[PDB]
Paper text:
For structural studies, minimal constructs bearing the C-terminal six-bladed β-propeller head domain of NarV-RBP (Glu184−Pro657, termed “NarV-RBPβ”) and MosV-RBP (Glu202−Thr632, termed “MosV-RBPβ”) tagged with a C-terminal hexahistidine tag were generated. Beyond the β-propeller head domain, the NarV-RBP constructs also included a small C-terminal extension of 31 residues of unknown function, which is not present in MosV-RBP and BAVV-RBP and lacks sequence conservation with other paramyxoviral RBPs. Subsequently, the NarV-RBPβ structure was phased using the partially built MosV-RBPβ structure as a molecular replacement model. Additionally, similar to Mòjiāng virus G RBP (MojV-RBP) and Ghana virus G RBP (GhV-RBP), the C-terminal extension (Asn626−Pro657) of NarV-RBPβ, which does not exist in MosV RBP, was disordered in the crystal. These combined observations are suggestive that disordered N- and C-terminal residues of the narmovirus RBP are intrinsically flexible or require the stabilizing environment of the higher-order NarV-RBP and NarV-F assembly existing on the envelope surface to form an ordered state. The interface between NarV-RBP protomers is similarly substantial, with an occluded surface area of ~2,160 Å2 stabilized by 19 hydrogen bonds and three salt bridges. In contrast, the putative glycosylation site in the NarV-RBPβ (Asn575) crystal structure was not observed. However, given that treatment of NarV-RBPβ with endoglycosidase F1 resulted in the reduction of molecular mass, it seems likely that the GlcNAc at Asn575 is occupied, yet mobile in the crystal. Despite exhibiting only 31.4% amino acid sequence identity, NarV-RBPβ and MosV-RBPβ present similar overall structures, where structural overlay results in a root-mean-square deviation (RMSD) of 1.6 Å over 401 aligned Cα atoms.
Here, we study the RBP presented on the surface of rodent-borne paramyxoviruses Mossman and Nariva (MosV and NarV, respectively), viruses that constitute founding members of the recently defined Narmovirus genus within the Paramyxoviridae family. Each protomer of the RBP consists of an N-terminal intraviral (IV) region, transmembrane (TM) domain, an α-helical stalk, and a C-terminal six-bladed β-propeller head domain, which mediates the interaction with the cognate host-cell receptor. Crystallographic analysis of the C-terminal head region of the dimeric MosV and NarV RBPs demonstrates that while these glycoproteins retain the canonical six-bladed β-propeller fold found in other paramyxoviral RBPs, they lack the structural motifs associated with established paramyxovirus host-cell receptor entry pathways. Additionally, using an integrated crystallographic and small-angle X-ray scattering analysis, we confirm that MosV-RBP and NarV-RBP form homodimeric arrangements that are distinct from those adopted by other paramyxovirus RBPs.
Residue numbers in the entry:
A (entry chain A): 198 to 626
B (entry chain B): 194 to 626
C-alpha cells in the first residue's frame, strides 16, 4: 500500500475531557482529492455519500445518476478505498487506491460503510425503484454485503430477506446510508425494518422539539401501511463477515418509542470500552440534532445525548410548521461525529444561511465552540458525511477530519461530490 | 461483476483509415453529453489548483494524469502528480463511459512536470521531467533534468525507471532534454512522445516566421521567441523521444531533434499514430505567440519535418486584458487551452476543445478542412477554461453515425477559487452530409 500514517478514533477515551477552546481563527482546510469528478457541467447527480476511516485506511461510497436525482433504475453505485498519507506539506491527506462501480440493474441504495484492518465493507439494499416505492409495493429486498480491499477485490454475499435472524417477525429489512463498524467478525450498521405495530410501544412524540405534538400525528409519521398496520422501525444490523457458509446475519429491532422517525444514521464504537454511540440523521419532521448512546438491556434503547440546541433548517420554499409532525421537513444534510467517548464533544457538517452553505460546527455539551462556513455565496449543501481521526500519538492541539459532501455548485446543474480535510481544534481552554 | 480489464468495451482509434472520407454533416442539434466520472475531486472549495491534464485511450482502456497544487498554480515544490487508469464500459443507458480502476500519486519532492501519456493493452506509460522549480527556471539555471518513465497497469504495480541526462542516445548534440505534457503512443517496444531540447543554434536553420498566422512577422523577433540563452546561443527545439518500454537491461532511450524551421515555437503537444499505415499526426499546443491551431504530420526524411495541415482558420484567443499584437512574435500570448484530436488519417477532420466567448467558456469544435461543422458551448456563464485534453474513439464495429469522445479539462468553476478538474463524454457526430 501507499505509505500511510497510523490513525485512531477521535472518540477514543484518550480524547480531551477538559472544556475546549473556542477556535476563533479560520480553519486550516487541506486537500482531500478522493472520489471522482461527477459531471459538474452535464447535469449528473450524486447522492448518499459516506466516508469512514480506520487506521489510515478509508472507504468512500456514493450513488450517481443522470439527468435527475431520482433515477435508481439508471443509477451507478460507486465504491472506493484508499489510504491517508503525508502530503508535500507534511499534512495527512487521503488518496484513492482502488475504485469500483456497480451498474444497475440492480441498483444499490442506502449503503453503509465500515473499515477494519485494511479491509472495507459495504451493506446495500438491492433494489430497482428505491426504498420508498419498495415499502409501498410491500417488496422484500435482497441485501448485499460487499467486501473490498486495497488489492482490488470486491466480493459480494447476497442476504435473502427470509435469512435474517430476529426474535420477532418482521415484514422486510432495509439498509440505510451511514457509517458502521466491524467488530468480532461482525459488521454492525443502522437499518430500517417494516414491522406491524405492537400495543406496548407507541411513537415517540412530545418533547423539547415539539412540546404539544399530537400522538396520532406521530404514529402517522412512522406508519408504512394503514391497512396492514405496519411501521418503519429503526434497527441494528449485525452481519457476518467471516462465514460465507451458514452465515449468521442478525437484525436487532428498536421499538418505535425510541425515535420520532426511522432514518439513516451512523454507529460509532468506542475502541476501549465497546460502548456504541449513534448519530440519527434527519429528513423527517424532527429538527433536533439526534445523537446518543445505544444501550442494549432488556431491549435496545437509544439514550439521547444533548449535543446542541441549534435546530436543523427546513428547505427554502417551506413556510409550514417547523419541527412538528405535520409541517416542514428537516433537511438531511447534518452529520455529526463524536470527539468524546460519551459524545460530550462533537464535530459536524451543517447547512448555514439561507442558501444552506456547507459549514463546520464544533459543539461541547450545548456550547457552540465555533460555527464556520466552508464557502458562502449560492453553494447549497445537500448531503454530507464526516470522519474525524487522530494521529498515533495524537497531536496535542489538532485532530484531522475528512468531510465528503454533495453540493449544488452551479445553477441548473445537479448535486456534485466534493471533499475536503481540515485540522480540527482539540486544544483545552 | 464490475467494470474491469476483461469486461470492457472494445474500441479503436478515431484517426484509423476506416474513418469517414465523405463531406460531413454539420450537426445542428445539441450534443448528447454523457458522464465521465474519472479523476478525483480537486478541492473546488479549498483553493486547490490542477494543471497539465492529459487523457489517452486504447482499446477500451484509458490513462489520465494531472498536476495538483495547494493555494496557487505555481508551486512545483509542493505539488502532487496524479496518475490513473481505468476502462470504458457500457453505462446503465447502454452508453460507453470511462470509469477508474487504479489511482497513484507522486508526492513532491521531487515534482514531475510535463508528463506525456500512452496506453497499450492493459499497461500505461508516463514520461515526466524530474524537477523542483519547473521547466522555465530549469532552463534559465542551465540544469540537465532527469526524466522518469512510469509503468502502470490495471492489475499491476506502478514502477519507475530513471533516465539520466547523459544516458540519452542521439544523432545530435544537445544541452538538455525536457518532457512536455500531451499524448504519445506505445507501439512494439517503444514509447514515442513529444519532447523539448535546449540546443545551440545552427547556421542553416532559422525560426519559422512569416505565414498565414503572421504575414508581417519579423525574422529577428521570431528567432528571439525561440531563444533560451542569448549568451550561449541556445534555442528551444521540438523533439521526439523514443523510450524503451520492454527492456530493463541496457535500456535504449533515443532523442530525435527537429530543427527550429519546422515550428514557430517549441511547445507541448500530442502525437497520433495511424494504426494501419503508421503515419504520425501531431497537435502542437499553443501557449506561445502563434494563435493558429497547429496540426500536421511528422515526416522523417533527410531530417525530421513537421508538415503543417490547415485544419481551421479560427484563431486561438489571447488572455483577458491583453492589448499587444495578436498571433505575432513579441506580443500577446495565445492561450494553451485548445486541444485537437484527429478524426481522419490525414487530419482532414478534427474535433477539439476550445475556449469560447469572453470568459473562455469550454466548448467543442468540429472542423473538416477549414469548414466549421459545429462550435457548441458546454456551459456558459463565467466558467473559464484553462487546459484540456481530448480522446475520441470508435466502438468496433463503428457506430455508423457517432464516435465517442472523452474530454478532460481544468476549469475555474467559482470566483476566488483555482482551476478544477472536470471531465465529460459525448457522442461525436460522424455522419455524412
Amino acid at each position: 500500500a501507499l505509505y500511510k500514517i497510523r490513525t485512531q478514533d477521535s472518540w477514543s477515551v484518550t480524547a480531551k475531557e477538559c472544556p475546549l477552546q473556542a477556535f476563533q481563527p479560520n480553519l486550516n482546510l487541506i486537500p482531500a482529492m478522493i472520489g471522482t469528478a461527477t459531471g459538474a457541467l452535464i447535469r449528473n447527480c450524486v447522492r448518499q455519500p459516506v466516508i469512514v476511516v480506520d487506521d489510515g485506511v478509508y472507504m468512500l461510497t456514493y450513488l450517481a445518476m443522470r439527468g435527475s436525482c431520482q433515477d435508481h433504475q439508471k443509477s451507478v453505485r460507486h465504491f472506493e478505498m484508499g489510504v491517508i498519507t503525508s502530503d508535500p506539506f507534511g499534512d495527512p491527506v487521503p488518496t484513492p487506491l482502488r475504485h469500483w462501480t456497480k451498474r444497475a440493474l440492480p441498483a444499490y441504495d442506502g449503503c453503509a460503510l465500515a473499515v477494519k484492518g485494511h479491509a472495507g465493507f459495504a451493506l446495500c439494499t438491492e433494489t430497482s425503484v428505491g426504498p420508498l416505492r419498495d415499502r409501498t409495493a410491500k417488496r422484500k429486498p435482497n441485501i448485499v454485503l460487499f467486501k473490498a480491499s486495497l488489492v482490488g477485490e470486491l466480493s459480494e454475499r447476497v442476504i435473502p430477506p427470509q435469512s435474517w435472524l430476529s426474535g420477532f417477525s418482521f415484514f422486510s429489512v432495509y439498509t440505510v446510508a451511514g457509517k458502521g463498524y466491524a467488530y468480532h467478525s461482525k459488521f454492525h450498521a443502522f437499518g430500517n425494518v417494516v414491522r406491524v405495530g405492537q400495543s406496548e410501544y407507541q411513537a415517540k412524540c412530545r418533547g423539547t422539539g415539539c412540546p404539544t405534538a399530537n400522538q396520532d400525528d406521530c404514529n402517522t409519521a412512522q406508519r408504512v401501511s394503514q391497512e396492514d398496520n405496519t411501521y418503519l422501525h429503526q434497527a441494528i444490523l449485525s452481519v457476518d463477515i467471516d462465514s460465507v457458509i451458514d452465515p449468521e446475519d442478525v437484525v436487532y429491532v428498536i421499538e418505535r418509542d425510541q425515535y420520532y422517525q426511522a432514518s439513516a444514521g451512523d454507529l460509532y464504537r468506542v475502541p476501549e470500552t465497546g460502548e456504541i454511540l449513534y448519530n440519527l440523521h434527519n429528513g423527517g419532521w424532527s429538527n433536533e440534532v439526534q445523537v446518543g448512546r445505544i444501550q442494549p438491556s432488556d431491549r435496545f434503547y437509544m439514550r439521547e445525548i444533548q449535543l446542541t440546541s441549534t435546530r436543523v433548517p427546513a428547505p427554502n420554499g417551506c413556510n409550514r410548521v417547523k419541527g412538528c409532525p405535520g409541517g416542514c421537513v428537516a433537511v438531511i444534510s447534518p452529520a455529526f461525529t463524536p470527539m468524546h467517548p460519551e459524545f460530550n464533544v462533537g464535530v459536524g457538517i451543517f447547512p448555514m444561511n439561507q442558501p444552506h452553505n456547507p459549514s463546520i460546527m464544533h459543539v461541547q455539551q450545548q456550547t457552540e465552540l465555533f460555527w464556520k462556513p466552508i464557502v458562502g455565496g449560492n453553494i447549497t449543501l445537500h448531503e454530507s458525511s464526516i470522519a474525524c481521526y487522530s494521529t498515533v500519538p495524537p497531536n496535542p492541539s489538532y485532530d484531522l477530519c475528512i468531510g465528503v459532501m454533495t453540493l449544488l455548485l452551479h445553477q441548473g446543474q445537479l448535486p456534485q461530490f466534493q471533499a475536503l480535510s481540515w485540522y480540527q481544534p482539540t486544544m483545552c481552554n
